[PDB]
Symmetry: D2
Subunit: 125 residues, 4 copies
C-alpha cells in the first residue's frame, strides 16, 4: 500500500519534469519539450476568443516550433500538490516571446517516473 505523505523525493521528481518543459520553452524545440509529456497528453487554451488549443498536445509542439524559443522567458513553479500517483502543478511564465502565461498541470507518476498528462493555460491581457 502506497502512502500519500508528501515527500521531498516526489517534489523533486515533479520539479524535474517541469524543468524539462520550462527549459524547452526557453531554449528547446517542440520535440525536446515533448519529453516532459505523456504520449497522450492534452492541452486546452484560448488565444483571444478562439480555442486555439482543443486537445491534441501535438498542437503545442508545432506551435513552439513556429514561434521559436523564448530566450527571455521567466518561468516559476508556484504550486505542487501531490497525492500518491497523481499531482497538480502551476507555472507562471513572463516574456514568453512577450506573452504572460498561467499554466495548470496534472501529472501522473507513470511507472515511478512523473510525467505531465494534462495542461491548460490562460493568456493574460
Amino acid at each position: 500500500g502506497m502512502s500519500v505523505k508528501v515527500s521531498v523525493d516526489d517534489i523533486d521528481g515533479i520539479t524535474e519534469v517541469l524543468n524539462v518543459y520550462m527549459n524547452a520553452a526557453e531554449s528547446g524545440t517542440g520535440e525536446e519539450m515533448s519529453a516532459a509529456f505523456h504520449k497522450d497528453a492534452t492541452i486546452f487554451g484560448y488565444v483571444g476568443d478562439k480555442l486555439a488549443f482543443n486537445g491534441p498536445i501535438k498542437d503545442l509542439y508545432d506551435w513552439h516550433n513556429s514561434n521559436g524559443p523564448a530566450k527571455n522567458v521567466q518561468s516559476r513553479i508556484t504550486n505542487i500538490d501531490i497525492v500518491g500517483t497523481v499531482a497538480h502543478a502551476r507555472v507562471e511564465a513572463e516574456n514568453w516571446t512577450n506573452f504572460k502565461f498561467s499554466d495548470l498541470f496534472l501529472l501522473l507518476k507513470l511507472d515511478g517516473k512523473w510525467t505531465i498528462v494534462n495542461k491548460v493555460f490562460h493568456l493574460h491581457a
Copy 2:
C-alpha cells in the same frame, strides 16, 4: 481579455459543474455524469499496478454504469484555483462504493460556461 480577478460568480459556476459530477457519482448514470465534462475530456488513474484509466473519458462513464451509483459516497470540494478562462479543482470522495478517491481537475470556461476537460485521481490504499 478576461480579468483574472477571482469572482464569486466564477466560483459558483465551477462549484455548479462539480456538483453535477458529485451528484451523478451518488445517484446518477455515466451519461448524467458526462454532463459535467467536455466532449474531449480525459481521465488518468491507477487501480493497483494497472493504469485502468489511460485517456478516454468514456471509460469513466462505462465504469460508473457497471459499478453503479455510490449511495453512501461523501464528496467535498477542497480547492478551486481560478485564473480567467481555466481553473484547477480538487475533490475528496469517501465510501464511493467502499472506495476513497482524491480527484484533481482542470476546467475550461467554454463559451462562458465552466466544464471539466481533464481528470486524474488517486485511489487510497
Copy 3:
C-alpha cells in the same frame, strides 16, 4: 502521532468553523465571530497605506462591531489544505459592506476541534 491523510471529517470541521466566521460576518456580533478563533489568534492587513491590523485579533471584533453586520455579503471557501493537526484555508468575500476581501487562514486542531489561529487579508482596490 496523527495521520495527515485528508478526511471528509476534518474538511467538515474546518468548513464548520469557517462557517462560524462567515455567518457572524453577515449577521453576528464581534463576540459571536470570535467563537471561530483561538484565544491568541492574530490578524494582519492593510487598509490603504496603513496597516490597520497588526496583530491583535481584538481589533477584528471591535471593527466588526462598529462597522456592523454585512447583510449583503457573499463569502465562499475556495481552498482547504489540511495536514494532520494544522491547516490553511482561503475565503473570498464580496459586498462586505461594499468591500471585497481575500482571506488567508491558518487553523489549529485544538484538542480535536478546529479553530482559526491566524488571519491575513487583502482589501481589493
Copy 4:
C-alpha cells in the same frame, strides 16, 4: 490601485524571504532566522500531545539555538499563493535533525518587502 495579477516579481520576493528561513534552518542561528519574520510573528505546533509552540515566535528562535542547525535538512517550497499584499506559502522539511515538518505560512508585503507573519507546523509521525 494595486493589481492582484500574480507576478514573477512577488514570487521572487516571497522565495527570497522563505530562503532566509530555510538557510537559517540549515546553517544559521535563531537570530539569523528572525530576519525572515515580522517582529510580532507567531508559531503554533504540537510535539506529541503537548502544544509546545503556543504563540511566541521567540520560542522558535530559542529552540533553534538549543537544537542547533540541521546540516542535513532538505527543504522545499511547494506552494506560493499570492494576492496583493498578503500570501500563503508551504514548505516541506526533511531530516531537520531527523524531524520531518510541514510549514504553512502567512506572509505580508510590509512596505514593499515580503515577510512571514504567521507559522503553523505539523511534525510527521
